[PDB]
């Protein structure tokens, strides 16, 4: 790596380069992070269940460790995530009798959580994914079902953004989602954010998770999504980038290693992706990978538990893959 280009330096005039981490991977991949990224995101430790597991019981230890690491290396930090239909404790929506709480009570709980968490990291975390995956991923409906929406109503997102803005008015607030480039969902996300912006709601950016495959979404779809979202006047962050070696329909579990064809196509794919991102450097301000090296990736167990995937720029031995070279030479 002595002669190896540094990702953050290569893209210094285009966008920050980040990685999702946890105390364990920070240790395991410490040198890679130190040499390549200038932004950090907590893979799981800043989610509701890991910050307030029980009402009134806040567990900031792991999150604090991640933030300390980032700050000691002058890396920015993205907060992920405040309001989501996943990884949120049941206590949040229930009362003493186990029955669902009212709209006003849930809003109080939402405001308290957001206020406590955001205020703790004010000045250290520059942006927050306030609402995560609220848009439906299937069907004709605009919104996905969730207890937040069920109890509060469809304006639960408006409230979440307002509470976060109040907690830290200097933070960039994001609506974050996946499958963001498929036309049907793109239009739903566009419509949603436009509606909020049209109401004066403090939403400053759209986070494109970019959990992509070798084939999907197409480069044209990515370009169209970038332009569509950028037209709203919001900042864009690619927040959880990875390029799976398996398409959604491919649920094989016998591959002990990727084929030369997979590795080659992945390299081309990453080169095309970054060439496109660089083209839109004026609207894209940060690109975060959901991890950094193939020795750790959530794709090893999702959507198929127990297999192995090789979705990032560095291999299991922390050595640059062909995708690395195409990515940095755009
Ligand atoms: Na930029």
Q: What is the CATH number of the domain that holds 30?
A: 3.20.20.80
What is the CA(13)–ligand 1 centre distance, in A? 7
What is the CA(14)–ligand 1 centre distance, in A? 4
Look up the domain containing 249 and give its range.
1-330
d(CA 34, CA 40): 11
Contact criterion met (CB below 8 Å) for 291 and 243? no
Q: What is the DSSP letter of 314?
A: B
What is the CA(249)–ligand 1 centre distance, in A? 34
In 19-144, alpha helices (H): 23-28, 30-36, 48-51, 61-72, 103-121
What is the CA(16)–ligand 1 centre distance, in A? 8
Resolution (A): 1.7
What is the CA(235)–ligand 1 centre distance, in A? 9
What is the CA(58)–ligand 1 centre distance, in A? 35
Residue 249 phi, psi (nearest 5): -80, -20
Cα–Cα nearest to 127, from 165, 73, 156: 165
d(CA 73, CA 33): 9
What is the CA(286)–ligand 1 centre distance, in A? 7
Resolved by: X-ray
In the numeric block, the tokens 């660089």 are attached to: 278
**Long-range contacts (CB closer than 8 Å, 24 or more residues apart) made by 141-144:** 142/188, 142/191, 142/192, 143/192, 144/85
What is the CA(234)–ligand 1 centre distance, in A? 12
Count up the domains in the chain and report the number: 1
What is the CA(61)–ligand 1 centre distance, in A? 32
What is the CA(253)–ligand 1 centre distance, in A? 38
Four-CA torsion 49, 108, 151, 186, nearest 10 degrees: -70
What is the CA(273)–ligand 1 centre distance, in A? 15
3-state helix, strand, coil in the chain (%, to 5): 40, 20, 40
Helix axes 219-230, 260-279, angle to 10 degrees: 30
Residue 15 phi, psi (nearest 5): -170, 160
């Amino acid at each position: 790596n002595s002669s190896l280009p540094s990702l953050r330096d290569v893209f210094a005039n285009d966008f920050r380069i980040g990685a999702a981490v946890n105390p364990v991977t920070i240790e395991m991949q410490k040198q890679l992070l130190i040499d390549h990224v200038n932004s950090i995101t907590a893979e799981n430790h800043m989610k509701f269940e890991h910050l307030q597991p029980e009402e009134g019981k806040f567990t900031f230890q792991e999150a604090d460790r991640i933030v300390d690491f980032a700050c000691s290396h002058r890396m920015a930090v993205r907060g992920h995530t405040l309001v989501w239909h996943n990884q949120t404790p049941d206590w949040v929506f229930q009362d003493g009798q186990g029955h669902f709480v009212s709209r006003d009570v849930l809003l109080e709980r939402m405001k308290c959580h957001i206020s406590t968490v955001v205020r703790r990291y004010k000045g250290k975390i520059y942006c927050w994914d306030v609402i995560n995956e609220a848009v439906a991923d299937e069907g004709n409906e605009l919104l996905r079902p969730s207890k937040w929406r069920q109890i509060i109503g469809d304006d639960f997102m408006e409230q979440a953004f307002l509470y976060a803005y109040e907690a830290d008015p200097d933070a960039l607030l994001f609506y974050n989602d996946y499958n963001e480039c498929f036309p049907e969902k793109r239009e739903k996300i566009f419509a949603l954010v436009k509606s909020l912006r049209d109401k004066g709601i403090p939403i400053h950016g759209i986070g494109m998770q970019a959990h992509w495959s070798l084939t999907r979404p197409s480069l044209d779809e990515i370009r169209a999504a970038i332009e569509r979202y950028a037209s709203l006047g919001v900042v864009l962050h690619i927040t959880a980038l990875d390029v799976s070696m398996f398409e959604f329909h491919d649920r094989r579990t016998d591959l002990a290693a990727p084929t030369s064809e997979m590795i080659e196509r992945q390299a081309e794919r990453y080169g095309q992706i970054f060439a496109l991102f660089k083209e839109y450097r004026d609207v894209i301000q940060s690109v975060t990978f959901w991890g950094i090296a193939d020795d750790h990736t959530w794709l090893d167990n999702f959507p198929v538990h127990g297999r192995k995937n090789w979705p990032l720029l560095f291999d299991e031995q922390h050595k640059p893959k062909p995708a690395f070279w195409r990515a940095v030479s755009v």
